[PDB]
Swiss-Prot record, chain A:
Cellular component per GO, a single term: cytoplasm
Native source organism of the sequence: Saccharomyces cerevisiae (strain ATCC 204508 / S288c) (Baker's yeast)
GO molecular function, a single term: large ribosomal subunit rRNA binding
Name under which the protein is recorded: Large ribosomal subunit protein uL10
Residues of the whole record sequence present: 4 to 200 of 312
Name of encoding gene: RPP0
Compartments (UniProt record): Cytoplasm
Swiss-Prot record, chain B:
Residues with PTM N6,N6,N6-trimethyllysine: K4
CDD domains per the UniProt record, alphabetical: Ribosomal_L11
Protein name: Large ribosomal subunit protein uL11A
Lineage: Eukaryota, Fungi, Dikarya, Ascomycota, Saccharomycotina
Entry function: Component of the ribosome, a large ribonucleoprotein complex responsible for the synthesis of proteins in the cell. The small ribosomal subunit (SSU) binds messenger RNAs (mRNAs) and translates the encoded message by selecting cognate aminoacyl-transfer RNA (tRNA) molecules. The large subunit (LSU) contains the ribosomal catalytic site termed the peptidyl transferase center (PTC), which catalyzes the formation of peptide bonds, thereby polymerizing the amino acids delivered by tRNAs into a polypeptide chain.
Amino acid sequence: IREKKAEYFAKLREYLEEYKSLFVVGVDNVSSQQMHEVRKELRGRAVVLMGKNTMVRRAIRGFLSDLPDFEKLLPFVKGNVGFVFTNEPLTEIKNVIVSNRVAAPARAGAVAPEDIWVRAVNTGMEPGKTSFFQALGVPTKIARGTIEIVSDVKVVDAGNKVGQSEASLLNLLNISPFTFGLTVVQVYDNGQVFPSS
Amino acid sequence: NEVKYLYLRAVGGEVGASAALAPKIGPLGLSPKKVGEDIAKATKEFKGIKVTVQLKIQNRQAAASVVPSASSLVITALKEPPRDRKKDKNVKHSGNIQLDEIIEIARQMRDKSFGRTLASVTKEILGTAQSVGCRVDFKNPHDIIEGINAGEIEIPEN
RNA sequence: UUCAUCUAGACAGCCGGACGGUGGCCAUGGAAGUCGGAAUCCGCUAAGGAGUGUGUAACAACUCACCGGCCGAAUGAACUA
């Protein structure tokens, strides 16, 4: 256990004194294919090292003696966040990181990434699913055996975890708005951190 | 035109049965006979060894495309007489495929793979060969992988 | 009593994921990581087991190990009387 502890510490040290800049990438809601693809795109350009918050915090505190910069990086590693080290233009590294986003389906009890509406379109299903439509109280009429939502309804949005009801509704609507992807909290660069924005 | 996608696992260079063709393709107005024949033609080299066959149904053309399967390709290079189901079930494989050949399969599979290095992709394909259980360069793929890891098999990374 | 885990976050719970190659090969009537048979393959790895199990004729799909987030300091096992 302590051996692999030291190994992880050494790898963090290597990246910290081998890569001029790093990004603080959040992996919340993110699948594994996501960060695999992001590493594939970043290959050569950037490397990705993610891990346990306490792990990285202790490593940083133990490197503090030699690197007096990272006390400002200590208070930024919270939640599911890791470090993408690089020696390449911050902008392009960032867009490559935040570009690979897979449209996963709307699942029950899953915080909606954005304001998922029910935008009116000839959806093409039947009273069986009109049951769900009424369940969530969206006026929907059976147009030639193809449902149409008369009025847009503000079902879900950022946060407000998607209950089974809305999840099922969006699944039958065949919309995958949960385009999960790695986010960026802050940006370390040459001993200077600044927000991504 | 509609971009449709459908594959199978029909056995290589063996006419595909209509009971295993019609349920999938039959609905979308496409000839199972044509599908089977095209599969056999694309698996001419693969004869006997099952292969995945992607079909792009762009307005109803049964144009088979063999997608490279690492293990099946390994067996095709193993060159064992096409597996004779009749003579004996579960025909074992013991192909002597050379390091050059396994590297070749690595280059022909890296396209759709995730191995960091060409060496990594070689280790993947070697692991597939190990799963197959054949002996490779008079050695097991496990020890070949360990040699590559310990820096013995200098890989032509091109 | 002895052996362990543990602020370099222990056990419990909750939440998120739990891969690519790969529905791996072999076949099973049908197995799709899992009725199944050998190896538990490489890479990315925080993690992911050709998977832990369930489900399905098979599926599609879940779920667990596993890893993270929270939490805050204790916990687990085998014994003795």
